[PDB]
């Protein structure tokens, strides 16, 4: 634009919102059809490594 | 109320053989789980083997896991426990007893199998030579 003035606010930006919120939602999609680890944690005896 | 019996024993030798039958009744062997333990003179209780309805969760104790086989059939409801290659510090009492085979089962962690006797027989002798 040639000759114009604005003013905005980031921090009431809803962008950044939204992104935050789509972002979210994807990583939860990713996750849905592998497996969940829930098992594993049982009563673990553990010592040292030898390494 | 059920009732197990024991028979079989008398003198043995060490590096010999015995063969020991452990009739019982009024409980079912399908869903039955048969413990074993000696009492020697003197001394506290000690585990010697454990056995399922058909195989696997037939663990043996650290001390008695040598040449020791145990074994059940379902045809005659009974077991035996063989003694083989008989030691010096090995003779006391041996008491089969009864188990009642509580389990639990979580999708996650799956089946979780309790152990505690329940019923237990007259008891066996043993002796050494
Ligand atoms: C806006 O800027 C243009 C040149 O970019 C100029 O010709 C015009 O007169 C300006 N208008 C105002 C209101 O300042
Ligand atoms: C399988 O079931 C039959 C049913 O009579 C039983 O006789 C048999 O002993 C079972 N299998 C084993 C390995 O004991």
């Known amino acids: 634009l040639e000759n114009v003035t604005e003013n905005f606010n980031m921090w009431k930006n809803d962008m950044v919102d939204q992104m935050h919120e789509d972002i979210i939602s994807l990583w939860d999609q990713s996750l849905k059809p592998c497996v969940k680890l829930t098992p594993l944690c049982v009563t673990l005896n553990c010592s040292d490594a030898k390494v | 109320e059920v009732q197990l019996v024991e028979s079989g024993g008398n003198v043995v030798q060490p590096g010999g053989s015995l063969r020991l039958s452990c009739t019982a009744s009024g409980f079912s062997f399908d869903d039955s789980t048969m413990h074993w333990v000696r009492q020697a003179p003197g001394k506290g209780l000690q585990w010697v083997s454990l056995?399922?309805?058909?195989?696997?969760?037939?663990y043996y104790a650290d001390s008695v896991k040598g040449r020791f086989t145990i074994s059940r059939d379902n045809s005659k409801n009974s077991l035996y426990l063989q003694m083989n290659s008989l030691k010096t510090e090995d003779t006391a009492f041996y008491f089969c007893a009864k188990d009642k085979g509580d389990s639990d089962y979580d999708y996650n962690l799956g089946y979780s199998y309790f152990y505690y006797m329940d019923g237990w027989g007259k008891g066996t002798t043993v002796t050494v030579s």
């Open positions: 056995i399922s309805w058909n195989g696997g969760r037939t």
